[PDB]
């Protein structure tokens, strides 16, 4: 995939949600079917014990 | 949805210590003398009649 940058015919693209989608996300004006998405975090912990 | 399993308890809180110890009973039930020798002595004074 690496090679195929270099020959152009994939490029990197970063594009905006269309408005009208924007506004009807899980809900509003009585669409389904379209959620919004969601981020979250988890914590997880290490332990050390002492030797002598 | 992050949830409570996601996070992780760090030390439990030490709530109550619980020892046990018996309701000791020997400053009532005894006479207790501290004695000065490592030889204690009782003396027991009686009365007689002439039939001792």
Redesign the interface.
Known sequence: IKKQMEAGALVEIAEGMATSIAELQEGFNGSTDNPWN?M??????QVIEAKS | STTTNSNSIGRPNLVALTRATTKLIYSDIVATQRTNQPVAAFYGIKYLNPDN
């Open positions: 969601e979250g975090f988890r914590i997880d912990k």
